[PDB]
Structures are given as C-alpha cells and as structure tokens.
Amino acid sequence: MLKGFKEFLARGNIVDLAVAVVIGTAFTALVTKFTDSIITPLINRIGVNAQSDVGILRIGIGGGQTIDLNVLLSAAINFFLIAFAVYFLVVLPYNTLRKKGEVEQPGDTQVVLLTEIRDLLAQTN
Amino acid sequence: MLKGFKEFLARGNIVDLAVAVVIGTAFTALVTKFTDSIITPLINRIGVNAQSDVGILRIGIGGGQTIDLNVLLSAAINFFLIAFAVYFLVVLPYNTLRKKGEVEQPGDTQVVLLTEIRDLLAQTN
Amino acid sequence: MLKGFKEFLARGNIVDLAVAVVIGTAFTALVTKFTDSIITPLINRIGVNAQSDVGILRIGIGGGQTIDLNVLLSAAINFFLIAFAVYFLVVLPYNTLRKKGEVEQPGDTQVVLLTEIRDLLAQTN
Amino acid sequence: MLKGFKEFLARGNIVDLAVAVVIGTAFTALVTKFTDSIITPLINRIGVNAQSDVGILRIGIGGGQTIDLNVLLSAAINFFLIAFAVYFLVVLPYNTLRKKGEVEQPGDTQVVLLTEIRDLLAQTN
Amino acid sequence: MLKGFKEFLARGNIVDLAVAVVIGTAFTALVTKFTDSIITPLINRIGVNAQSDVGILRIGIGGGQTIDLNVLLSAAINFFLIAFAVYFLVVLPYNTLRKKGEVEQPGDTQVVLLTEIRDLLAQTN
Ligand SMILES: [Au+]
Ligand SMILES: [Au+]
Ligand SMILES: [Au+]
C-alpha cells in the first residue's frame, strides 16, 4: 500500500498537479471569503441596487421578485481582486524571474540539449 | 523551509497549473453569479414552469412536490453564456495566434529542433 | 500590463488548462442542475426511501434522524448520466477519430522525427 | 466560427483535460454525497461528539456555541472512502498496467527512441 | 464500449489528471471542514470581530448590516493549515525524493538520454 501510493507518486506528475489544484482551490476560496465578509457588506449598506418586478408564478407561488445588482458588482469586485492578487503576487515574480532567466522547466532543458545537439551535429560537417 | 517551498515553485509546472485552475474556477463562478442575479429573476418573473405532482414520502414527510424548469433553463442559459464567453474571449485569440503562429510552446520548439536535426543527419549522407 | 498578461498567455499552456477546468466545472454543474430539477423531484414523489432511526445526540440536541436514499440514488443517476454524456458525446468521437487516425499532436510528430533520426543514424552505421 | 470551435477541439489536449476535470468533479461529488446520506446520519445517531461552550459574541449575538466532531469525523470517513476508491478503482489498474506494460504514452515511446539512439550512437563508437 | 473507454484511458494523460483533481479537491475539502468544525467555533466563542453599520437597502429591505471579521480570520487560518498540510505532507517528501533522485519521470529519463547523446555526439569530435 505504501508502495502503491509511493510508486504512483514517483509516477506522480499527478502529485505536481494535485498540489496545484489544491492551492488553486484553497486560494480562490480565500479571495472570495474576503470579498464576502469585507466587501459584500460594504456593497450592502448602500444597496440602491436590487431592483425588481412583480412575481406570482402561476406554476409555483405568488408574491414578488427581485434583481440583485449588488451581488453582481460584489462578484465583479471579487474577480478584480483576484486578478490583482494573482497577477501581482504571482505574475510580477514569475515573469520577472523568467526574463532574468533563473526559473526552470523540463521542456526548456530538453531544448537546450537538443540545441546543443544541433550545434555539435553541425560541427561534425 | 523557504528553500523547499521556493524550489518546489520553480518546479511549478504546478504554478502554471494552480494558476490555471484559479482563473478557471474564478471565472466560471463569475459567469454563474451573473446568470443567477440577472437571468434567473427574468426567467422567474415569467415562471409558468415549475410544474409538479403530489408528494407524501411514506418514509420522510407528506405535503407536495415540484419540478422546476426555470432552474434547468436558467442553468442552461448560464452554460451557453460560458461557452460563448470562453470561446469568444479565449478561443478567437488563442486559435488565431496559433494559426498566425505568435503563441509559443516547449513541445513545438523541441519539434523544430528535432526537425533540424533530421535535416542535418540527412545531409550527412 | 496588457503586454504582461498577454505575454504570459502566449506562454499559456496555462490558457489551455484554465479553459479546460472552466468547461469541466461548468459542464458538471449543468448535469447536476438537470438532475436536481428534473430527476430528484421524480425520485421524491415516490420517495419510499429516506429511512431512519431515533436521534437525540447527548452532545448536541435530541429529536430524530434519517438516512436519505433518494439523494444517494439521485446522485448515482446524476453520475451515470455524466458517464453517458461524456463518453457518448466525447468518447465515441475521439476514440473513432484516433482509430481512423486524424488527430494531430506535438508528441506524435516528435516520435515521427525521433523515428526518422533513428533510421538515418542506423543508415550511417 | 464552426471552423474555430472544431479546430480548437482537434487541438484539445484541452478536451483530454476538460474530460478529466469533468470526471474528477463528478466522481468526488458522488462519494461525498454517499457519505452525507449514508454515513453522516449514522455518525449522528451516536453523536456523543459535538461538544461546546457558551457563546454570546459581544459583536454579533448572544446565546451558546458548538464544536462538531461528527462532521469532522464524517468528512474524515468521506476522505478515506475517496482514497480507497481512487486507489482501488484507479490505482490498482493503472499501476498494474504500467508495470505489465500496456498503458502507452508519447513520452515513453520517445524515451525508447532516445534510448535506441543512445545505443546506436554508442555502437558507432 | 469497454474498448472505447479503456482505449481512451491508456490514452489517459486524462487519468493521471482526473485523479489529480480528485485528490486535490478532496483534500482541500477536508482541511476546510476541520477548520470549520474545530477552528471557527474557537474563533467564535471569542468573536469581538463581526463589526457593522446600519443597513436599510432602499431597493431591497431595511434593518441592519455586518462585516464578519471572524470568518475572514477563520478562512485565513484555514489557508495556512492547507499550506502547512500540503507542504509538509506533500512537499518534504517529493522535494526530498527528487533531490535524492529516488523519484523518476519520463521527462527526466529523456534528459539523461539527451545528455548522453549530447555527450557522445561530442565524442565523435
Ligand atoms: Au400536496
Ligand atoms: Au425521534
Ligand atoms: Au449558551
């Protein structure tokens, strides 16, 4: 069992990925929770949004219906906050490190080797 | 420790992925929120949908039961909006950049290299 | 800024992935919404499921408790429908196109080149 | 337009992926649903868990507060069930197939090719 | 049918990934549940947070509104626990195994081979 989980993990391109979804989900969850506790309430004190129209579904009930705009705006703001947080926390550093050329990846090293291979092959002739 | 987390992050084919799931979930969520606040209500002012039949679960309760179509239809519209949104915002540009050729990738460059190698090895004959 | 987001996207193996999660989550959501509105109610008019046993948690409350089977079954049905939908819509077409041989890919072209190289190298020797 | 969606789909390394997320979310949801309907109720009849302490938030309300264990354990059990399910349904078969050598992959065929090349390049010397 | 799903599965880069999303979502779900059951309550007996301001939406209702801070801190702590959990359970072992090199992967063997090839091509000169 320790062998199946561990042998699958050496195999575990899956491990790199599982972690990625783990962080990705954990983090999106954090930004939206901040938005709900801090932002949505702010949107709400004001709320001259949520308009409406009469709603007596002759199939379900009968009383009144609304169009909540504050929620949409609350969500839009949440979205922007995510883009700023990700781009700023993540993007400035990863893009800066790839430009200064200090980050890595399997495809890139293969390329260097393939390239070196090309050069030597060229030298033989 | 700072070493383990950072070393794992340059490693972060995972980083590319985590970000991808982060945006994918964040965005799908934004579209569904719009569908729910703006669209579901419009579907609802009408609502000649939600039909039903008697429901007295001789196992749970006893009172009445409903089949909501407005929700099914509201959900479907949400989906189309996502398909159009992803395809139009994401698809027209990425597919157009690949056809014109501007977007890049590790596999493609390896190909270029392998190809040149093939051409050279052929030249040696 | 427009340059940074766009340059990271050209970079975006991530874009391929983010899009994938977006569609995958959006679609699963659609299937379950159909199951809940059309199917669960049907399970429920019948609902001779949800059994139970007394439940007075001497730690939290005291009143009664139930085992909802209708939900378990509704979910299962939801699942089978997903399997029929993905396999029938996605699988019949991708397995049939790979069998007839018409789907291109970076890994496959590389193999072709690697193979040509092997053959040529064998010719020199 | 039909050309853009279809050309992106032949392209769909993404399709492979979307299907993966689609299936992954669908299945996990199925297990947790079984956990909730079947398992949680059982945890709950017993429930000598959920302990507590008075809770009158002088900032929000005022009355009493609880620490639920049955849920923590219910989730824990849900989790073990997922691991056994994924590992047993998924892991025994893919690890056995990779070991017996039947599940193929572009990366692996390339390896064989690279390996063969190494061997040949070596015979020349 | 058994052939199409199975043929698609050997094909299944998708299988590696789907399993990855399954484990990532399942695990994040577990961390947050622990936080909610064990942690949020602890945060709450205390709760001198959830501040507020009057809230009578001249568009929706009219009565009062709150900015729940406890939830924000509760979510943050949840996040740390995930970071600690993934890195400590996942990171120490994978980072250590790669350093000891005990861990294997198709990309890495490709590199070794590319290197040897580079080295041999270099010897011919
Ligand atoms: Au009734
Ligand atoms: Au009872
Ligand atoms: Au109390």
Side-chain angles (χ1 to χ4, degrees):
Chain A
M1 310 172 91
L2 198 160
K3 170 214 170 188
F5 225 67
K6 184 172 62 66
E7 187 172 305
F8 206 25
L9 296 185
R11 165 76 288 180
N13 159 48
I14 313 162
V15 178
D16 283 65
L17 191 182
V19 167
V21 314
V22 156
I23 305 151
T25 48
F27 168 96
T28 64
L30 216 69
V31 178
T32 54
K33 274 293 187 178
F34 162 110
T35 291
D36 291 352
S37 67
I38 305 329
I39 298 175
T40 308
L42 275 42
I43 314 298
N44 289 44
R45 191 200 173 190
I46 308 167
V48 181
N49 311 293
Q51 229 74 312
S52 65
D53 216 52
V54 198
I56 295 170
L57 290 207
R58 183 260 117 67
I59 229 73
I61 325 278
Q65 188 65 67
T66 72
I67 282 187
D68 297 83
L69 301 312
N70 63 308
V71 50
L72 183 66
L73 185 138
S74 182
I77 299 178
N78 160 59
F79 189 64
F80 279 34
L81 289 188
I82 317 170
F84 284 42
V86 61
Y87 141 73
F88 201 121
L89 188 73
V90 180
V91 178
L92 165 149
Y94 211 70
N95 222 63
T96 289
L97 294 182
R98 264 300 191 193
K99 267 225 177 184
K100 276 187 180 179
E102 203 173 353
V103 192
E104 206 71 300
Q105 194 203 125
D108 292 54
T109 20
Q110 296 186 60
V111 166
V112 168
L113 289 192
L114 261 311
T115 310
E116 299 191 62
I117 301 285
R118 174 186 84 183
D119 300 355
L120 318 193
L121 198 55
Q123 288 285 177
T124 298
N125 293 47
Chain B
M1 316 172 87
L2 199 154
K3 175 209 168 189
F5 224 68
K6 180 167 58 66
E7 198 171 298
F8 205 25
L9 297 181
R11 161 70 287 176
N13 156 47
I14 317 162
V15 175
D16 284 62
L17 185 188
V19 178
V21 314
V22 155
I23 312 138
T25 42
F27 163 98
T28 58
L30 211 63
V31 180
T32 51
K33 274 300 181 184
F34 163 109
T35 292
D36 289 355
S37 67
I38 307 314
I39 305 177
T40 319
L42 275 52
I43 315 298
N44 285 50
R45 198 284 192 179
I46 311 165
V48 178
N49 309 292
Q51 224 80 309
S52 73
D53 210 52
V54 194
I56 295 172
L57 286 209
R58 187 261 115 66
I59 231 73
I61 319 279
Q65 188 66 69
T66 79
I67 291 184
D68 305 77
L69 281 277
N70 69 302
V71 58
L72 178 61
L73 187 142
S74 181
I77 299 172
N78 163 58
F79 189 63
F80 275 38
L81 287 185
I82 323 174
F84 286 42
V86 54
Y87 146 72
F88 198 117
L89 191 71
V90 180
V91 176
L92 162 154
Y94 205 74
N95 214 58
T96 287
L97 293 189
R98 270 299 195 196
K99 264 222 175 184
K100 280 193 173 184
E102 294 79 60
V103 171
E104 190 76 297
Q105 200 199 116
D108 288 57
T109 29
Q110 292 189 54
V111 168
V112 173
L113 289 186
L114 261 318
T115 302
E116 309 189 48
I117 305 301
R118 165 192 85 187
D119 298 357
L120 305 194
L121 197 54
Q123 287 288 179
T124 300
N125 278 294
Chain C
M1 312 174 95
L2 197 158
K3 170 208 173 186
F5 226 62
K6 184 165 56 62
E7 191 172 302
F8 208 26
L9 299 180
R11 160 75 285 177
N13 155 46
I14 318 162
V15 175
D16 285 71
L17 184 188
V19 178
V21 315
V22 154
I23 306 143
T25 42
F27 166 95
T28 50
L30 211 63
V31 183
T32 53
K33 274 299 185 184
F34 166 111
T35 294
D36 292 352
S37 75
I38 303 325
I39 307 179
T40 322
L42 279 47
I43 313 296
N44 293 41
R45 201 279 184 176
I46 308 172
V48 184
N49 312 295
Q51 226 77 312
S52 62
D53 210 54
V54 194
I56 298 164
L57 282 206
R58 187 264 115 65
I59 231 69
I61 318 278
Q65 189 66 68
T66 78
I67 287 185
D68 299 83
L69 285 284
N70 71 305
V71 56
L72 180 58
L73 182 139
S74 175
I77 299 178
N78 158 58
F79 190 65
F80 276 34
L81 291 188
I82 322 173
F84 285 36
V86 58
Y87 141 73
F88 202 121
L89 181 68
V90 183
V91 179
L92 163 149
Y94 212 74
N95 223 61
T96 287
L97 294 189
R98 267 303 194 187
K99 267 239 170 173
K100 285 194 174 187
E102 265 160 343
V103 200
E104 195 69 302
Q105 202 201 102
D108 295 49
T109 15
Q110 286 192 65
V111 172
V112 170
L113 279 187
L114 259 323
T115 313
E116 303 182 56
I117 307 283
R118 163 185 94 182
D119 301 343
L120 305 196
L121 201 59
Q123 284 282 181
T124 297
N125 199 181
Chain D
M1 310 175 91
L2 196 158
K3 172 209 170 189
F5 226 68
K6 181 168 58 65
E7 191 175 304
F8 208 29
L9 293 182
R11 164 72 281 179
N13 155 44
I14 315 165
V15 172
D16 280 60
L17 195 186
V19 177
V21 322
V22 146
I23 310 156
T25 46
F27 162 102
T28 57
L30 208 64
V31 191
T32 56
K33 278 289 191 177
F34 164 107
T35 293
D36 300 342
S37 76
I38 307 328
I39 306 177
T40 319
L42 280 49
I43 315 294
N44 291 38
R45 196 284 199 173
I46 308 170
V48 177
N49 313 292
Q51 225 76 308
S52 75
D53 216 48
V54 198
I56 298 166
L57 280 210
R58 190 256 118 71
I59 223 74
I61 323 278
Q65 187 68 71
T66 75
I67 284 186
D68 301 80
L69 292 190
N70 66 304
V71 53
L72 182 66
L73 184 136
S74 172
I77 299 180
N78 162 57
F79 190 67
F80 275 34
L81 291 195
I82 317 169
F84 280 41
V86 57
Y87 146 76
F88 198 116
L89 190 75
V90 180
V91 177
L92 160 155
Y94 207 75
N95 220 56
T96 285
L97 292 196
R98 265 302 194 190
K99 273 226 173 186
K100 285 189 178 183
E102 291 157 288
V103 183
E104 186 84 300
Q105 195 200 116
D108 296 47
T109 22
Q110 297 186 62
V111 171
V112 180
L113 289 184
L114 266 307
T115 301
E116 302 196 56
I117 303 287
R118 163 190 84 193
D119 296 1
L120 307 197
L121 201 55
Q123 288 283 173
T124 297
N125 299 40
Chain E
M1 310 173 92
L2 201 155
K3 168 211 167 188
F5 224 67
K6 180 165 61 65
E7 191 171 303
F8 206 24
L9 296 185
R11 168 69 291 183
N13 159 44
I14 317 168
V15 177
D16 281 63
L17 186 182
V19 181
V21 314
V22 153
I23 313 154
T25 44
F27 167 92
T28 61
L30 211 63
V31 181
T32 57
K33 278 294 188 180
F34 163 106
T35 292
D36 294 353
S37 62
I38 305 319
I39 305 175
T40 318
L42 275 47
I43 315 299
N44 286 36
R45 193 260 232 179
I46 308 169
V48 177
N49 311 291
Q51 227 78 314
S52 78
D53 217 47
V54 199
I56 297 170
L57 282 211
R58 190 261 115 64
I59 231 73
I61 322 277
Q65 186 71 64
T66 78
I67 283 185
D68 300 84
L69 276 288
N70 64 311
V71 56
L72 185 66
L73 186 136
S74 181
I77 297 179
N78 161 62
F79 192 63
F80 277 35
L81 292 197
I82 319 165
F84 284 42
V86 56
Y87 144 80
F88 199 123
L89 187 74
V90 179
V91 174
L92 156 159
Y94 207 71
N95 218 59
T96 287
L97 293 187
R98 268 298 197 192
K99 269 216 175 187
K100 281 193 177 186
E102 225 160 320
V103 169
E104 197 63 307
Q105 206 200 103
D108 290 50
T109 19
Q110 288 192 58
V111 173
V112 169
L113 291 186
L114 262 308
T115 313
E116 302 191 56
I117 300 298
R118 168 188 79 186
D119 297 350
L120 321 195
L121 200 54
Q123 282 291 178
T124 297
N125 302 318

